[PDB]
Nucleic acid binder design. Sequence first.
RNA 1: GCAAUUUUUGACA
Length: 674
Amino acid sequence: QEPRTLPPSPNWYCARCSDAVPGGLFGFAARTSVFLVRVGPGAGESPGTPPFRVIGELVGHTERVSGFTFSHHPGQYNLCATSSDDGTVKIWDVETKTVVTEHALHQHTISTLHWSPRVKDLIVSGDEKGVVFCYWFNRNDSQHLFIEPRTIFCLTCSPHHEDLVAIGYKDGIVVIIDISKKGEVIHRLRGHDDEIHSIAWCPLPGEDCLSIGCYLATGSKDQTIRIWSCSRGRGVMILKLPFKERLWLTLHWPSNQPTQLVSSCFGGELLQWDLTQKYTLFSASSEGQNHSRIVFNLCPLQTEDDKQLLLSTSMDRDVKCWDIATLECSWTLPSLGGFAYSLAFSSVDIGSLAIGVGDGMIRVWNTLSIKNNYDVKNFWQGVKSKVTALCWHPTKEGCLAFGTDDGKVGLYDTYSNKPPQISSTYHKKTVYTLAWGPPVPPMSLPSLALYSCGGEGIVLQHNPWKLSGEAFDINKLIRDTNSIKYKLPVHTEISWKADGKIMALGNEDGSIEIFQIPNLKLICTIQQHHKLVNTISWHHEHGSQPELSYLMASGSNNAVIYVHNLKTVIESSPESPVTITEPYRTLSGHTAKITSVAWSPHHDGRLVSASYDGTAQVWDALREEPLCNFRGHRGRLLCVAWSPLDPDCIYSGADDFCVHKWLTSMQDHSRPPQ
RNA sequence: GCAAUUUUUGACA
């Protein structure tokens, strides 16, 4: 099949931090980057599914990207410009994703910028003190214009007149300045009394094309849209938004229908206004396709097959694409508002992928959905903290355990409209891991108990049918059974052998302990890692030889991954615990902490590892062979999960707020960077 | 959708 990305959420409260060029390509500022989305036939997506894909990222700003604008000049649609709280304006080439050139002319926080629609190399930027810079990127010239001591919110160069720029301020002031006359103010458009969010020029020049020079429209926090006459410097029309509610009021003035005007509205609803008169709501016949929070940016995009689309960004973290002909939602791209901490596929709902995210919502992605490549449901009730751990029930459909950074353990019925059940017992620290296993005493004295491991070092056994009851610290059983007097290690990982007969605990000191049912008799201690154990995974039971099921891979804060073979020690069932000090296999190549390892269900002994070194490595573990290295994340990987359907496909999540679905066969590098 | 949120996580172990 083919790669796919859930990207970070578009940035909020910026008058222009997204834009699109024909064909086409959509770009949106998110965090300190711009993410690029191919839209239309060029996307190369599965037939019958929405034609778009996230394809690249502009990396280099060191603080929030506040502004983004493409060059709309034929022959240079690949050029674009950004502004950032790092104080720079960068010019980029999207083909190579590199900085062409840049400036640091602004002495105050940049508000926005706009590529001249008329002058091929002109980018105009404005800051929160009211200073405007003109920048001609080819001659490397610039001009400083300090118009008014006033906080710029938005700026839009005229599409008709190369010298005229409209500027909108936090206090509701709107001016038109002439950049050839040292930024002289040509018009003061008085009327708004609160933030200007958007300025759109009429796409036709002249003032003989409207039922009541050039016309322009301004949208404001004051809940009105004003249309102005650029000859008489006065208002000619006021539109009042229909029903302190949130509002970002942005505009798009369609070229093919200049008597119409598109705006955002309360709640992120989109409206098409008839200027010859009043408004039509987008997606009126299924209102639920609308955004559910304020919309910030609207960007038209005409595909190479001449479909006229409109992309919208929103506080609700969805990017939506609208068919302007029908006012219907063509597709929705979901996005992530924090680290992708955890990934888990359900064994009983094929392709159902749960994602634990730092923004306090669980995503469930129906990855195999035929209608939609990003069929994602969001669960927030009872979550409300970073989701650091997940584990689907092994047999119960829709039953999902989750754990949070604040120590909470919960149980979701994802097929339902119900809030989750919360365990009355919390960990003191982050929930690292959840696993289902057979109950142990006193609980065993439900087919499966829920086990949770917290950062404080305790593993708890929860009864999924009595979560408001007490959870049990398994150390009490471990001590009893094994006659342990000493100070218990701090547990940092738990992993059940597939047969439910053997539990492995990883510890902060690097040790791995092997315990047997029914009473957790200690049969083995593995002393191989020298640092905290993050991840343990037992090989599946459906490989070509029974021996494979005794294989256990593990990763610590050191870079070297080990495989151990527990067949001898388990089958011997010793009456006093053995120590293993030698690995069955060693997998060297990463250069930082290993956060997660997972065996392919499709192969004998094929492992993928996620690392702080910013890569996922695929190994033929039994031959200690590095196969391929995925380098698509820009940050520390936190989780990895094999596709349950495709031997070639792996999903990974990182602290770059991204989930990538990628193919082992498409990777150029065989090993991690050295 | 029917919540909240001007959000966007120093590093070790």
